[PDB]
Each structure stands twice: as C-alpha cells, then as structure tokens.
Amino acid sequence: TYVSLADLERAARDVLPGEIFDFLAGGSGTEASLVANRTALERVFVIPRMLRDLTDVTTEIDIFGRRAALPMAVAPVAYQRLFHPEGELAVARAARDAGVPYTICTLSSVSLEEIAAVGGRPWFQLYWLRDEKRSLDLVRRAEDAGCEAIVFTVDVPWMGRRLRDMRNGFALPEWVTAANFSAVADHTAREFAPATWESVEAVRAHTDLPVVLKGILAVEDARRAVDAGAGGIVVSNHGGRQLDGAVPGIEMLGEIVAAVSGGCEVLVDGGIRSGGDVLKATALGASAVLVGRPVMWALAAAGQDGVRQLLELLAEEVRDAMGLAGCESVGAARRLNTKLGVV
Amino acid sequence: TYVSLADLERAARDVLPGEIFDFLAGGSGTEASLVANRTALERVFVIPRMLRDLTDVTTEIDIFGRRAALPMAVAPVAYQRLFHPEGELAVARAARDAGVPYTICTLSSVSLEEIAAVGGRPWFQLYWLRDEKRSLDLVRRAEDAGCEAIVFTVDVPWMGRRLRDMRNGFALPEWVTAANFSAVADHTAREFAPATWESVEAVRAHTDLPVVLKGILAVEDARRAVDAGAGGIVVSNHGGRQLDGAVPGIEMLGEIVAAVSGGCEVLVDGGIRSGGDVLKATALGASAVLVGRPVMWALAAAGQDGVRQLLELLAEEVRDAMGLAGCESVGAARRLNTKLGVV
Amino acid sequence: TYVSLADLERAARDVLPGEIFDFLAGGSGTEASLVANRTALERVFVIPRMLRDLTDVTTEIDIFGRRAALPMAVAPVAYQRLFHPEGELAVARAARDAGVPYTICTLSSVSLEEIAAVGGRPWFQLYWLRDEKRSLDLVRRAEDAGCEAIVFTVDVPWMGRRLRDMRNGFALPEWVTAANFSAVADHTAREFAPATWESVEAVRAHTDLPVVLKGILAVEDARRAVDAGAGGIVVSNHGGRQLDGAVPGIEMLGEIVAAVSGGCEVLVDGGIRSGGDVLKATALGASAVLVGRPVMWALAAAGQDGVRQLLELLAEEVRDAMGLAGCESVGAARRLNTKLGVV
Amino acid sequence: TYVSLADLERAARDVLPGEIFDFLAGGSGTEASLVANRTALERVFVIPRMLRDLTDVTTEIDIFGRRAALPMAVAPVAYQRLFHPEGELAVARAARDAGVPYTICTLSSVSLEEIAAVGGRPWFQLYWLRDEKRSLDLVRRAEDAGCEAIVFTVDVPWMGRRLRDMRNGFALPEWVTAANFSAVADHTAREFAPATWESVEAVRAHTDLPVVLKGILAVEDARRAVDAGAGGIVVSNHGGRQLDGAVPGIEMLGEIVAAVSGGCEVLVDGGIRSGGDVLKATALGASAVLVGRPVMWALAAAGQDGVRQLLELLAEEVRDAMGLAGCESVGAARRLNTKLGVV
Ligand SMILES: Cc1cc2nc3c(=O)[nH]c(=O)nc-3n(C[C@H](O)[C@H](O)[C@H](O)COP(=O)(O)O)c2cc1C
Ligand SMILES: Cc1cc2nc3c(=O)[nH]c(=O)nc-3n(C[C@H](O)[C@H](O)[C@H](O)COP(=O)(O)O)c2cc1C
Ligand SMILES: Cc1cc2nc3c(=O)[nH]c(=O)nc-3n(C[C@H](O)[C@H](O)[C@H](O)COP(=O)(O)O)c2cc1C
Ligand SMILES: Cc1cc2nc3c(=O)[nH]c(=O)nc-3n(C[C@H](O)[C@H](O)[C@H](O)COP(=O)(O)O)c2cc1C
Prior knowledge:
4 copies of one chain form a homotetramer.
Chain A: H1 5-15, H2 18-25, H3 32-42, E1 44-47, E2 61-63, E3 66-68, E4 72-74, H4 87-98, E5 103-104, H5 112-117, E6 123-126, H6 132-144, E7 150-153, H7 163-168, H8 183-191, H9 197-206, E8 211-216, H10 219-227, E9 232-235, H11 249-260, E10 265-268, H12 275-283, E11 288-291, H13 293-324, H14 330-334, E12 337-340
Parallel strand pairs in A: 4-11, 5-6, 6-7, 7-8, 8-9, 9-10, 10-11
Antiparallel strand pairs in A: 1-12, 2-3
Helix pairs in contact in A: 1-13, 4-13, 6-9, 10-11, 12-13
The structure holds flavin mononucleotide (4 copies).
One flavin mononucleotide is lined by residues 23-24, 37, 75-78, 105, 107, 125, 153, 214, 236, 238-239, 241, 269-272, 290-293 of chain B.
PDB class: flavoprotein
Keywords: FMN-dependent oxidase, flavoprotein
Assembly: tetrameric
C-alpha cells in the first residue's frame, strides 16, 4: 500500500544491493544536474482554475497514432534484470495493462522481440551503433516486432562519468547481458559511435515510424529536430547522468514548446515523481512525460505487481491534480498558467 | 500567557491526539503548497511610513454590511469538536466577543442554527451538495438563521490527497458528526458534487446575501467572479490541502486586486500567523484575511478562553503593526508599499 | 586581541546576564527584520577598482560641520550602564579618542551633560516627550551642552513587541535609570507621544543644529525629510526592534540616495559588522553608517578599552577594504558599483 | 586513483599541518568571496548541443603565442615548498608534461631561473616592488629565462586580512624562503608598493612579452587594460583572499568579454574544480581558466605524480564535458549558451 512514489524508493533501497541502487540513483560528476531536475520542478507552481465542468475528466492522450491512458510513458532504462529477475517483461506487462507506452531499450536484458510480444504497442529506444548498417538493423527489427516509435537517444556520444559506479567498481553481473546483441562506461565508449544529424536522416529514411529525439535541450536543436522530420523530441538532461551542469529539461521546456509551435510532440523527463509533477510539465507545454527511476523502484520492490501499483498511483494522482486544477482534459492542462516561486 | 501564535501551536500539539493534530496541520501530497504559504509571506517586507497622526488608530473595517473589529475573520474549518468538546460554540462565542466574523461550516459538528444563535453576525460556508435543491436548502437555512454572507468554497470538486490522513488511517470518532445533515476523503467524493459557474448563479439567485467565492487563484477567475455578481472572493489554495503545487494566494493577491479594481472584496488566507502578516496582506491589497489553523490551536489548548486570548493577541499585534507602519486605518495600510526580499 | 567584530559578540555573551544579552540582541516579533538586516548585506557584492593611486588613503569625512575619522558614528543605544558600570562615559571616551561621533540618548543612564563633558563633539538622540515644551527642553539642554546634531528618532511612536523581553520578564535593575529625567515597553507607551511632521518642524525651529531623522524607509518620507529642512536621515528599521517585517534600510538606501539627490546626508544602519560592510553601505550611496550592538559587545567585554579596540579594528578594516577596492577617499567609495549575488 | 578534484582536497587535508592547510584554503574576512566563487559557478547551467561531429574533439588552445593542451594554466601560488619539499619544481614538471602553462611566482620558494629550466614555456607573475627599477629587473630576469608572459597581479596593493592566518599566528618555516630575493601580511605591507596604471605602462615598455593583468573585476578596468596594451586579463577576486565582499570573477566575466570584444584574452579564476566548471567558464566567454588550490592539494598529496594525476583527470573531464555538450573545439564551447538556475 504505497501512497506516494517516495514510498517505492524506500522499498527499493531496502532490497537492492548497494551498487545496483547506486547504478540506478546516480548521476554524473557532482550530481548537480540530477539534483537540479528536482529543484527545478519544486520551484514551479500551478495557477489552478475553478468551477469548470468535470463530469468526464479524462487523462488520455493521442500520441504517435495511439491512445495512451495517461500523458506518460515508461522511460528507456537499460538492463532491467539488474532490478528484478523478470526485468523488462514485468515492466512491459504492467505498462500494457495500464495503457501506458513502454520504451524497449537497445541495451535491454531481454530481447526486443520477447518484450514486444507482451503487447501494449511499445516504443523502441535506439543507441547509434558502430555503423549505419547495424543501427538500421535494430530499427528494422523493432519495426518488424510492432514497435510504434523510434526514440533515438541523442545525448550519449559516450556515457557520462558516473562517480558512484567508478567508486563501487560497478560491472554487470554475469547473468545480465545486452540481449539484443565503470565497466558499463568502458563498454559504451568501445561499442557505440557518436550520432549526428546525418544519423537522424539515415533513421528517418529507414522507417515510416515516428522518430523521437531524446536529449534535446537547446532551442535551435528543437527547431532543427522539426526541420529534420522528427515526430517528437524529449527535452531531457538524461536524468543528470550525462553532462554534469546540463540545464534541466523542465527549465527549457516552455521556450522549446514556443519555438516548435506544434511542429512535433514535445515530451520532457527528469525528476517526475507525482501526478502533480505531470501537471506542472503539462502546464509548461509538454505533450507527455517520461518516468524512469520510479518505475525501477517499483520493479525492484515488487516486480510486475509493484509496477502496476505505481502506475495505478500515478494515474490517480494525475486525475486528482487535473480535476483540482479545473482540467477535464490534458489539452486544458496545457493551457494552465504557472508561477515560479522560491523553495 | 501566549505572546505569539506559535505559543498556541506548541500547546495544541501537547494536548491533541497525533492523528487529529495531523488532520489539522497537514496538506495534500508533499505539502509543497502548505510550506509555500509560509515562505511566500516571509519574503514580503513592508515599507513603513513615519510621522503620521496616530491619535485614533482603528483596526476596524466595514465588510458585507457589518463593522468588524479587525480585518480578519475565522476561516471555515470542518468538525471543530475534533479539537475541543465545545467545538464550534466555543469558537463562535469568542469570535462574537472579539467582534470578528465567524464562518459556520457546511460540515460543522454543531448545527448551523445552534452556532448562529450564539450571535455575532456569522457567515456560512457552502459545499455544493448532490443537487441544486439541497444545496440551496442549506443556503436558505443559513439565511433564515441570520448568517450575513455565503462563503461558497470553489476549490473542492473533491477532497485533496491527505497523505498524513491516509497513513494514519484517519476517520472521525463516533462522537463527531456532520450536524447539518482517508475516510473523510471517501465521504466527500460520495456526498458532494463539483461546483461550476452555473452553481454560483443558482446560489446568487437564491439569496440576497453577498456570495463570496473561496479558493480563487487565477486572475480571470477573479474577474469572472465579479462578473458573476460575487460580493467577494478569498484568494486561497485552501491551506495547501487541495492541489499540491497550487500557488499561494499571497503570491496572486496583488495581481488579483488590480484586476478586480474594486469590483468586490478581496480576502486572502493561508499562513497568516501574526498581526504583521495581516499588515503584509493588507499592504498587498487584501480587504481582510481569514485565519484557520491558529484558531483551532487556541480551541484545542484552552477552549473558548484560548480563542479569546488568540484574538486579543492578534488584535494587539495588528494595532502594533499598523501604528509602527504609520497607518491610522486599514485603508492607509492598503496604500503601503512592499518589497520582496530573500530569506 | 580581537580580529573581527564577531570575536566581541562571543566575549559579551560570556559576561552578560542572559536577559541583558537578550535585551541587546533581540528584535520584535519573529525577528524577521533583525535577520534580514544581515541577509541583505550579505547579498551585496562590491565591484572593486584596481591600479588607482593609494599614496594617501583617508577614511575621513566631513559631516554636520565636523571632520570624523571614519564614515561611522556610534548609534543611540539606551541604558548603557546595563552593559558596564561606566556605561555611556566609557563609550563616549573611546569614541572621542577614535575621532568617531557618539550619539547621546534621551534614555541615557548617565546625564547628557556629563557625557557631553567628555568632549568629542557628540550628537543627541531625541525621543518625542509628552509635550512640545519638554521635548524642546531636552533639545535646548543638548545644544547648550555642545551637542552638534539632533538625531530625532521617528520610528518609535511606541516601542515594538520584544518577545525575548516579554518571555524573560525583563525590567531595568534598580541601579540603572533614565538619568536625563516588558517593563521598558510599558514605560515608553506611558511617557512618550508619537512624533509627527509637526514635531519635526517644532524641533527645526527650536535649534540651529542639524536635525537628522532616524528611521526613514519610504522614499517619499526621505524626500519629505529634505523638504522639512532635515540635515540628514538615517535609513533604518531600528535594528529589527520596531516593525517586524520592515524592510532593511540597506535595501532602500540606493533608491533613497537617488531621490534625495544630495539634499541631505543619508546614513544607514542595521547589521554593519565589518569595514567591508561599511564599504558596501558607502558603495550604495551612504554618507556614513551607525553601529549599535557591536559597540555594546565591546563595552560589555572590556569597558572603555574594549570600545577602543573595536574602533581601532573597524578603522583598520575600513582602510583595508577601501584600498583593496581602489578608493583613496570615501567619496571614491561612493562611486563604486555593486552587484547582488546569491548566498 | 582520484576520480574528482575533491578526492585531492581530502588527501591534502590528511597530510598537511593545520596552519598550512589554512594558509592554502583560507580567504580574507568572513570568507564571503571565497564561498561566493563556488556558489556562483554552481548557479550556472550549460545548454548543451547535440548531434555535432565529434570525430576529432580537441581541448587545445593557442594563447600568448603557444599551443596549450587545455584551456587552463596553473595559477600563481606563492611558496610551494610549504606543501611538498620539491615545491615549484614538482608542479612545473607535471605542468610541462601535461602541456599546461605554469605561472612562476615573484614569491616562489625556488628561484625563477631554476623553475624555468624545467622547460614547458612558463609564465611569470609579478608583484610590484619598492621601485620601478627593481620590479623591472624581475621582469627582465623572467624574460631572459624564457618566460612567455608577464602576469602582473593588480589586486594586491597590500595583502588582505587573512583571519585564519592571524588566529593561527602563521609564519613561514625557516626552510621556506622567497628565493627570487599574519607574518606574511606584515612582510608584504613593507616590501611591496601599490601598483598603478603607470606601473603597467612601465612594464609594457620594458618587455615585448604579453602583459596580463590579474585581478580585474570592473568592466571599465577591463576596457582600460585593453587600452593600456595588455595582452590579457584574469577576471578574478584572488580566490577570495583580498577584498572580502568582492564579486566573483565568474559573475563579471560575460559583461567583461562583451566589453573587451576580442581586444585581449580574457581568463577567469576562482573555484574551478572540474572539467565541467571549465566548460562553464568557456561558455561564459573565457579564453582559459587558472586553477590554484587544487594543484596544491595534488602537490601536497603526492608530489609531482599527484599533480600529473590531477592534470590527467582535468584533461579527461574537459574532453568529456566538451563532447557531451557538442563541442569539437574550445571555440565551439565559447558559443554555448548558459542559464542561471537556483541551487
Ligand atoms: C539506470 C538508468 C538507465 C538508463 N538507460 C537509458 C538508456 O539506455 N537510454 C536512454 O535513452 N536513457 C536511459 N536512461 C535515462 C532515462 O530514460 C531518463 O531520461 C532519466 O532516468 C530521467 O528520468 P527520471 O528522473 O524519471 O529517472 C537511464 C536512466 C537510468 C536511471
Ligand atoms: C482542519 C481543516 C479543515 C478545513 N475545512 C474547511 C471547510 O470545510 N471549508 C473550507 O472552505 N475550507 C476549509 N479549510 C480551509 C481553511 O478555511 C483555510 O483556507 C486554510 O486552513 C488556510 O488557512 P490557515 O493557514 O490559516 O489554516 C480547512 C482547513 C483545515 C486546516
Ligand atoms: C539595546 C538597544 C537600544 C537601543 N536604543 C535606541 C534608542 O534609545 N534610540 C534610537 O534611536 N535607537 C535605539 N536603538 C537602535 C540603534 O540605534 C540602531 O538603529 C540599531 O541597533 C541597528 O544597528 P545594529 O545592527 O548595528 O545594532 C537601540 C538598539 C539596541 C540594540
Ligand atoms: C596559498 C595561495 C597563494 C597565492 N599566491 C598568489 C600570488 O603570489 N600571486 C597571485 O597573483 N595570486 C596568488 N594566489 C591567487 C591564485 O592565483 C588564484 O587567483 C586563486 O587561488 C583563485 O583560484 P582557486 O580557487 O583555483 O584557488 C594565491 C592563492 C593561494 C590559495
């Protein structure tokens, strides 16, 4: 019986080995960007509206051609068998049952085809490989398996400096592997090549699926993403795991939404920890959010049923926040105003 | 012998059962809006005037056709028998004796007619019921009993998520009931319907009493309230108990006062804890404030006499603050300027 | 051997009875304005100049017709025998020897004529008495005794609410009296009348000495002071002892200096604790500062010799700060720019 | 195996005598400017760019006619034998091997000619001596020994008030001397004269080497430096060791870069503690940074090899930060935008 997402973090801390909790919790460098993701959300206040018709409040959205139950997807998180033996299958099953898109990772610890077979109209996250030809094979596999969007991660030319992982001497256990094919940082520097705008065009030409660029923070990169034919972007500093000192996505979101001016979907992530945070993101103009660490807390704590409980809690919090703010729909929530405060 | 409102909180904490203290103290979600009500007041500084005539300083105001001794009313707080056996009668008697309006609640634990019989020209707070017909019956009862204003609460389409109450498994004791007719959250979701602008018009047509909309935060909702024929509004986030992340009323007050441009009374609440806080609210343009939790601290600590002592202390602090700031009247206090500082 | 003013506070805390330390240290209400005086100074940063001629750095100023060794006077502090048996005589002797003006108080615990006989061209602080005639007698006594300015305190229509003094049940010991004629708050409410602009004019007509209005915070009150014929003002919230929530003087100083546009001397006080703080005040446009509590710390710690050591330390810190900032004179320091930072 | 610069501070604290750690760590006065150097950097966030070509990322710059491996030089720090017996020779050897300029101090504890003989194309820091003739002798010695720039320190007309050193009664041990010729503060007040713009011109006429003015904070002093023929400036508050309350250099840097408009190199120092901090400085417009205390931490911890490890770590962090931010060159990093956040 969890009444907040924070209840799940406490539960996950109890069960996970310290080094795996640190792999999950940590960020790069001094963790300034990790902390700032939370600080930035905490400074945003919503100006709610009153006395509106709430006889049919709905939290649903249409995105990338599918109805989703909430303005929320499960973020790509590598190697989910680190957290629970059922790994990605547990999370994908719960997401399917909740009507929430699940992002299958390039570095999934269960093969993308197995996770796709769970159903639920999943997305696929791409890391750019050694060459155009192989990268494009994963994309084609994902499309053949029924994935509905390609989430191209664009903020990882290589992995950031994870000092918790370095200090812990973290490496994957023998029983966790990259099923589609700091020791994890060394492996990435060797196996993956930096993506460029040319890589984006190669992907866009290889699939009719919407291509979503994850890790955009500069306004002109958002504009360029639209010009490049992206169907969406995720405004994100990769949970503070990449450039330490990168601005939080939530701080760039409003300016990016204005610049994009409806030319693509604009998602955000980093520190979303409640339905109220989802409302803040929506009020700043997001189409939807991604949620990362909390989904893994729930997986660690109680497997598939833990993820189900998390998604049920988030669904209740989103409905609650929307109605209290006078919003019968997510579109109405996007028209809310906000104020910055001091915390 | 209390010299500050904070002395009363300490006293109430000692006497009340933990779960009832939590029902009183708590807010929704992470309590961000609860804390922000205090932070927001603490950032406001007054620019006092000197060398003005203070030979007849008066703290009185005229509001809703009655002279009040202070620019202050007792906020609606449900179920006052939770805090002291005399409940609403103790508070209403002290308010009457102090010349302060008392707001009788829809969810009062003593009937509205009994509390009105105490005297003191009380107000009545309305929650919108299952249908127009019954809602309007409470309004007519209140008017027949001599209530002088209808304070229509507009920020409770349903009750917020009170995590202290959920964790405590809080429910009303058998000896406390809704005398006019989280377990308290479940009861509200079943018994009350979301109010709309149509509900406001139904009330306005049913009574000649001034209708005051409590829980307005958006500037256009304040304008619309005036257009709808409201006699007042209370700029309020419901003490941080409704939308977690709602802006504090004190942060919207100046902009609302400007937009309303004298078309209705503009009250504020949330975190008023001293006569100096009353002065800040007045300087930002409020007609008057409501005070909630501190009145219940005083009731818990010492019953009717506790509430009397609280109101005497607040009266002294308001007079002190006004005179130190060069204000012989509340109208002069409204013309004070303020500065935001850092705390 | 004290190397900072903070060394003196530690020393005074050791020696003074708790209730007398609290009478000295405390402020009104929640002490928000007391704390804000420090916060406000800490947020100000100086932009120093380099490579200027420092062959004859001088900290002297001319003010109210006298050369002073520093841009600094000892603030009026009532009842100095509370802190040391020699009281005002010890402080006045040290101030004289340092070339710093000393402000003799209406509520001095040694008669104004005795303190004036020490020499050093002192100032006299006036509280407005029961009637024009008696007030004007103190003014005439002060002038006859050789005081060179009248510092009319304008922010005390009555004494603020000193909760430390109330809680301690503070009263003057039998051996400390008002030699020119909370128990101290009760005594003031009875003996003194609120001053007005008419009182200022009565004083201005009664003496050719410069009249300095102490406790101005509003820009139009500063302008009006010039129009009224004041020779100076002290921009001040009375060390956070009067209106709790009054803006710090340091936050109003720049705007007041601009509005006054050389029409009178503009002093500031509240929280000056180093030569660097004096430099900040000067850079914001002050003619000079007053220093209150630290002078009493020094008096408590070591009598006349303690005050001498404090003034020597402040003199060294002022010279140091000025030269490091490229200022050969106080006038050059007034032309420094500042930046607000975060602390 | 250090993974951050903070690992080195912990190591240095363990080994150094307390008073020498304090000589190194401390600042003047209350250490407000020392702390502000860190606060100021922590508030700056970078807006990284994505999807750029990173096939040949280079951290090199050209400055004062030499290629440097990083946009970074070792700051002038007096008396390095305080920290390790090899002192300046250890640091200079490591800097040479890393391709980083080393600044030889006027108050070096090994003679400038010995340190220059190490190689690595060093710079020389000048304090203005008793007269033009002797000052100019050090300059000529430095030039004859192969130093490539003169870093004229302009913020030390005398040494600041180092309260840690005063409290510790710090003095140099007998075995540490000024090899080119608070007890250290007393020695400086006697031996050195305040520099002026005339001193700058005397130096500029005495050498063809670029003259770099270290300790500029005012925009017009930066402009004047260009007009005076300076080849560079270091925007700096001397690590918070000079004027307590001086603005951090990082807070003035952008405005200075705009005013200078390419007329000289603009360096910054104060609190640079990671490659991410170097990126922030570059994004604000710096040509390069200086690093002071961390180099001494490394020297204290492990001598020459410690400094080598520090420089290798900084080089890795700079490359990491640049690439994550989409910058193949330091010039691209200078074109990054930043956002101020709250911490
Ligand atoms: C343990 C972990 C692994 C991750 N792996 C990936 C990945 O393979 N691909 C990717 O695009 N993002 C990855 N992310 C980033 C997340 O998708 C997301 O951007 C980030 O966690 C911020 O959201 P949060 O604060 O909700 O966790 C990972 C995050 C974590 C914590
Ligand atoms: C225990 C409790 C019960 C309340 N019940 C009601 C209510 O029935 N109707 C209403 O409009 N507001 C209600 N309120 C909100 C108050 O009227 C007021 O808006 C809020 O407490 C903020 O003021 P404060 O910080 O002075 O407590 C309640 C508040 C508390 C703490
Ligand atoms: C114990 C005490 C007594 C004071 N008495 C007087 C007074 O009689 N008249 C007056 O104008 N100000 C009085 N002041 C105010 C000071 O003159 C000054 O405005 C204030 O202390 C702020 O300066 P500080 O922070 O340097 O103490 C008093 C202050 C203190 C602490
Ligand atoms: C122990 C110590 C000695 C220093 N000596 C000198 C000096 O002789 N000349 C100079 O221009 N700066 C000197 N500095 C200032 C540094 O060059 C640099 O401006 C400052 O330390 C800020 O950088 P940091 O935060 O990286 O230490 C000294 C700094 C320290 C800590």
